[model samples]
Structure formats: structure tokens, C-alpha cells
Target chain A: MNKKELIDRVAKKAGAKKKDVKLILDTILETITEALAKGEKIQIVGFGSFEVRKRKVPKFKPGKALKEKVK
Target chain B: MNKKELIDRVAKKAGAKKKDVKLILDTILETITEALAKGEKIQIVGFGSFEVRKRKVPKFKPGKALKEKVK
Candidate 1:
């Protein structure tokens, strides 16, 4: 699902409104962006983390859940 | 920052309740995970996308904002 569908599902599952979901999601993405831009990491124990591995071509590492999910 | 901190920041930034933020975020991560488990791509405009590149060593590609974030 795309973001719109994701937002809808999140709202439904979380029992929150779409507007709120959109706002929080936007900020979540923004905060994550800012963190990575500043070379910080966002780590959620059960979910995953967002960190830029400094390299010739930087890598975006999605924490454990992501790797496991896609595996 | 970590998951708790990220949720706190998102609640503050989005002007939403922390409970709501946390709920949505949890579900959002879940949805993203489910999507990728099916080998689907998640494309969020302005932000980036998430997809698994099938290879010997699987790779996760975070779309534009992620790349530009750490650039």
C-alpha cells in the first residue's frame, strides 16, 4: 500500500483520525530525515532504526523488523 | 533519538496526543512491514520509498528524502 492507504489503515487500526495520522506521519518522516541529515540515528527497539552508514555510497539501514519483514 | 523519543517529538511536532502518535506509528510500521513481506514497494512522494532489492544479499532502498538526508 502507498502512503494514503497506509494512513487509512493506520487510522483505522489505531482508532485515530486521518488528519492526525497524516500530521504525525509527516513529522515522523521529517524528524527521521532531520536525524539522518545530522548523522543521528532513530532506533525503535521492536521496529527498527534509521541511520546512514557513512560510506562511499551512503546506505540507509532499516532496523531488524524491516530486514526480517522483507526477508 | 530512540522510539520513545521519536514518538515524543512526533507528538510535539504534530500537535497530537502522544498516545495517538504512538498508536499510529506502531500501526504504520506494521503496515510497512506487511507490504514489504509481500515484496511490494512503498512510495511516499516528497519523502522516500521502501523496497527490497532481491539479490544475493538483499538490500533495502530508502527513496529520496533518505538519500538526500544523509547526503
Candidate 2:
């Protein structure tokens, strides 16, 4: 699923307006981009984590629960 | 930053209420979790992509634009 498809699913599942969902989704991505740009680490429990590694590359590690879910 | 800090930042940046932002953020994560659980590939342009690799592990690749930002 791409952004539009994901937005559609999220809007339907969350019972929110598509426009609002799209805006919030974009904002969320932008927020993360800025944080990673600043070399900040981001952790979302049960989801995953994002960090700029020693190689100066952005990386994501799936959370334990999520890893188990996809296992 | 953790989930709370992320919600706060997105809410502030998007000029939306904290409560609403939190809900959407949760929904977004849940949607992605479900998708990955089903082994679906998710791609959000200019953000990144997620896929369940051959070993059944979830993986993320930062988008080119995002990579440049962190570089």
C-alpha cells in the first residue's frame, strides 16, 4: 500500500475524514523527517524505533511486539 | 523522543489538538502494524517504506529525500 491507499484504510478504520487523516499523516512524516535530520532518536512502543546510526544513516528497528506479530 | 513527544510535536506543528493528534497517531501505528502482520509492503513517499523480508522480519528503508536530509 502506498500513501494514498494507507490513508484510505486509516480514514476508514479510524472513522476520520480523509482530508484530515492525510494532513495528519503528512505532518507525522514531516515531523519524523525533521527529527531524524537533527539526529534524534524516535521510539514508538509496539511499533518500532528510528535513529541515525553511527554511519550517519537513518535506521528503523521493529519493536519486539511487532516482530513477534509478524513472526 | 517517544510517542508522546512525537504526538506533541505533530500537534503543535499541524495546529491540531493533542487529543486528536494522539488518536490519529495511534491509528496510524495500528494500521501499519496490521499491514506488516499480513506481510504487506507499505510505502509512504518521501518518508520511507516497510516490508516483511524473507526471514519474516519487518524492515524499513528511508526514502531518498529523507536519506539526503540525514546525510
Candidate 3:
């Protein structure tokens, strides 16, 4: 499910108001990305960690959606 | 950050209470992974996305692993 669908599910499951749920959801999302960008990794219990991957740098590419936008 | 810390951080940033934020936070985390495990990528707009990445066999030094990637 997408964000909208995910919002409703989270509200129902979490038993919180939609506005409250959405707000925190957005904040959580933003913090995660900024934190990840800075720290390069993170961890959450019951969820796995985003740690350093031991590997080589293959040809990295961008997505069609991202590449086609704002160029 | 872990969900507990995340709960406080997002709740504060979200201008909400530390009460029930955990549920949606957990729900989203679980769902995101489930979505990633499927046949396609899980895109969350400007936040970013996750996808299944098949790794090429790698070359690395003793402690110099490459940064993790999004697939």
C-alpha cells in the first residue's frame, strides 16, 4: 500500500487520530532520511539495521522518475 | 533511530504526545519491509524508496566496505 493507504492502516492499528498519525508519520519519515544521510546507517529493534554493506561499487544509476524530473 | 527514540523525537517534532506513536511507527516499518520483499520497489515520494538489489560478487579490503546502497 502507498502513503495514503498506509496512513489509514496506521491510524486504525494505532488507534490515533488521522491528523496526529499523519503528522508524526511525516516527521518520522523526514527524520529518518536526514539521519540516514548523515549517519549512513541506522537500526531499529524488531526491524533490521541499516548498516554498512560489504561490497563493491557497481555502476550506480538513477530511476527514470528521478532522472526525468527537474532536469 | 530505534522506534523508542524515534517515538520521542518524532512526537516532539510532530508536536504530539509520546502516547500512541509507536503503533503507526511500527506498522509503517513492518509494511515498508513487506513491500520491499515483493517483486518491485517501494517508493515513498521525496523521502526515498527501497528495492531488491542483487549484488555482484564483490572486492573489498579487510575493513573498507563500500557504503550501503538502495535497490
Candidate 4:
């Protein structure tokens, strides 16, 4: 789902107002962008982390679940 | 920076109460995780998108900035 769709789902699930949920979503993303731009990593427990990683072409492998699903 | 550090920074920048900022942050992330778990892509304009990509060990190239920075 895209941003709006996700926001709707979140608002419904969290019992939050759509506008409030939207603000929360936007702020969280903005914060992540700001942090990553500054070369910081974001780690949310039980979810994966977002960080910048650099490697040569073909150097990294997709995660197992991704590999199986794609293949 | 870690989660607490991020919450502090976001709260300061957004003029939001720290407790509210924390809840917003957590909810946003939870929403994203739920979206990705359902195999959806997240596209935030003016910022990069997040989606699951699959590739063989040596197949994909890093983005230009990532390549230059790494090399």
C-alpha cells in the first residue's frame, strides 16, 4: 500500500484520528530521513533496521525470505 | 543514534511533547513494519522509497551516492 492507504490502515488499527495518524506518520518518516542524511541508523525492535550500507556490485545477497519469494 | 536519542531530537525539533513524540514514532514504525510484512512498498516523496528487493549475491549495484561514498 502507498502512504495514504497505509495511513488509513494505521488510523483504523490504532484507533487514532486520521489527521493525527497522518501527522505522526509524516513526522516519523521525516525524522528517519533527517537521521539517515546525517549518517545515523534507525533500529526499531522486532522490526528490521534502516541504515546505509555500501558494497560492490553483486557483493551482497538478498535475505532468505526475499530470495525464496522472488525465485 | 538510538531510539531515545531520536525521540529527543524529534520532540525538540517538532515542538511536540516527548511522550507524544515517542508514541508517534513507535506507531509509525509499527505501521511500516505491518505494511512491509504485507509486501507493500513505501514511497516518501523527496526521500527514498523502502521496498523489498531480491538479487543474487553479485547482481545488484548500490546507488550512485552509496557507491561513491563506499569506494
Q: Candidates' DockQ values?
A: 0.59, 0.84, 0.20, 0.30
A1-70 in candidate 4: lDDT tens per residue?
A: 5678777877877677788767766766677665555566776544445565544211223344433443
Runs in model 4 with CA error above 4 Å? A53-71, B53-71
| Consecutive 10-residue window with the lowest summed lDDT within model 4 chain A | A54-63
**DockQ value of candidate 1:** 0.59
Docking class of 2: high
Candidate 1 lDDT, B20-42, residue by residue in tens:
88888888988877777787777
Error of 3 at A27 (Å): 0.4
Q: Which candidate gets the maximum DockQ versus the true structure? A: 2
Model 4 DockQ vs. reference: 0.30
The lDDT leader among the candidates is: 2
True contacts kept of each: 0.67, 0.87, 0.34, 0.33
lDDT, residue A56, model 3: 32
C-alpha RMSD (angstroms) for model 4: 5.9
Candidate 2 lDDT, tens digit per residue, A18-42? Answer: 9999999999998888899898999
Clashing residue pairs in candidate 1 (N, C-alpha, C atoms within 3 angstroms): none
Off by over 4 Å in 2: none
Model 3 spans with C-alpha error above 4 angstroms: A51-71, B33-41, B51-71
Evaluated on chain B only, what is the TM-score of candidate 3?
Answer: 0.61
Which CAPRI tier for candidate 4? acceptable
lDDT per residue for candidate 1 within A5-51, as digits (tens), equals 88888888888888888888889988987887787877887666667
lDDT of 4 at A14: 64
